[PDB]
């Protein structure tokens, strides 16, 4: 995110950039005025998660990211397996020549 | 939640994320403006 440097796949449930997004804007922020006459008129935000609750919402499986130094992977992996299985025996009984 | 990583499966009716941030939420949460001329301008707010 230092530069806008992604290798991206949105195949995957997941894209790395608005992982990355979305870690950002839930961080503490300090608006320091430092407007020195209150020398030292500070602030302090909690972040919002809404980003990345989108980001995280779709995704099965494993989605785990590992950072190395100003650069992270993302590894997505999942396997899923279904089956399914029914019978149905409808009966009825007519006279002969008549409907049902 | 410090980093994305998430072992994930919507088909059982709780996803991990949605628990853990609403958990998060429900913290108690201190904007200290430490705006120093009053020195310690702090505040305390319940969470959702």
Same mark, same amino acid.
């Given at each position: 995110?230092?530069?806008?440097?992604?290798?991206?796949?949105?195949?995957?449930?997941?894209?790395?950039?608005?992982?990355?997004?979305?870690?950002?804007?839930?961080?503490?922020?300090?608006? $320091?005025?430092?407007?020195?006459?209150?020398?030292?008129? $500070? $602030?302090?935000?909690?972040?919002?998660?809404?980003?990345?609750?989108?980001?995280?919402?779709?995704?099965?499986?494993?989605?785990?990211?590992?950072?190395?130094?100003?650069?992270?992977?993302?590894?997505?992996?999942?396997?899923?397996?279904?089956?399914?299985?029914?019978?149905?025996?409808?009966?009825?009984?007519?006279?002969?020549?008549?409907?049902?």
């Amino acid at each position: 995110l230092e530069s806008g440097s992604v290798i991206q796949y949105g195949n995957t449930g997941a894209s790395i950039g608005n992982v990355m997004i979305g870690l950002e804007e839930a961080k503490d922020t300090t608006q $320091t005025k430092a407007v020195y006459f209150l020398r030292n008129e $500070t $602030t302090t935000t909690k972040g919002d998660y809404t980003k990345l609750a989108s980001a995280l919402s779709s995704i099965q499986g494993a989605a785990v990211s590992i950072a190395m130094g100003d650069w992270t992977a993302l590894i997505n992996a999942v396997s899923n397996d279904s089956s399914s299985n029914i019978l149905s025996s409808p009966s009825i009984t007519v006279m002969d020549n008549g409907e049902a």
